[PDB]
């Protein structure tokens, strides 16, 4: 895993471009991933 | 256990399987010319 | 909105399919997206 450099990410099939960081927002234990506004994947939890 | 099954069900009594929590390697499947028909709908077999 | 396509995000469409059968789905995305952008630009122009 890399943090501060934008790379190609692919979490359980879902993929795209951008950069990652620790989320200030907190998930509930069941939640997989979130989406800001419409079609803006804004946060995922590492499956590993 | 499904493809090499000793016997197969009837067409009117088609049997429905449960597959989960396991790794699928379809590359072995289509690389063997043991299937007369191999047709896919909506997803490319080469990218499974 | 998928505009009748298999999905909406380009990444899923390009991953699931191969170009000789994907091009139709990306094309069906393009026509609708271009229609929407043209509508937005026309509205903005008259508003301006």
Phi, psi of B45 (to 5 degrees): -60, -30
Resolution (A): 4.4
Residue C47 CB neighbour total at 10 angstroms: 6
Question: How was this one solved?
Answer: cryo-EM
Residues of C with CB under 8 A from a CB of B: 6, 15-18, 21
For chains A and C, CB pairs below 8 A equal 9
Closest CA of chain A from C41, distance in Å: 20
Angle A40-C39-A17 from CA coordinates, rounded to 5°? 25
Rounded CA gap, C30 and B32, in Å? Answer: 38
Residue C48 CB neighbour total at 10 angstroms: 5
Rounded CA gap, C6 and B38, in Å? Answer: 21
In chain C, whose CA is at the least distance from the CA of A8?
C11
Rounded CA gap, B33 and C13, in Å? Answer: 28
Tokens of C43: 């509205």
Tokens 């995305």 belong to residue: C29
Tokens 């997206």 belong to residue: C33
CA C14 to chain centre: 13
Tokens of C1: 């909105």
């Amino acid at each position: 895993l890399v943090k501060n450099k934008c790379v190609n990410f692919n979490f359980n099939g879902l993929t795209g471009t951008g950069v990652l960081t620790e989320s200030n927002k907190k998930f509930l234990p069941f939640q997989q991933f979130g989406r800001d506004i419409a079609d803006t994947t804004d946060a995922v939890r590492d499956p590993q | 256990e499904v493809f090499n099954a000793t016997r197969f069900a009837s067409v009117y009594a088609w049997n429905r399987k449960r597959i989960s929590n396991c790794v699928a390697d379809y590359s072995v499947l289509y690389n063997s010319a043991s299937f007369s028909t191999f047709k896919c709908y909506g997803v490319s077999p080469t990218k499974l | 909105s998928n505009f009748g396509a298999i999905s909406s995000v380009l990444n899923d469409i390009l991953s699931r399919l191969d170009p000789p059968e994907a091009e139709v789905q990306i094309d069906r995305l393009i026509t609708g997206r271009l229609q929407s952008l043209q509508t937005y630009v026309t509205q903005q122009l008259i508003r301006a």
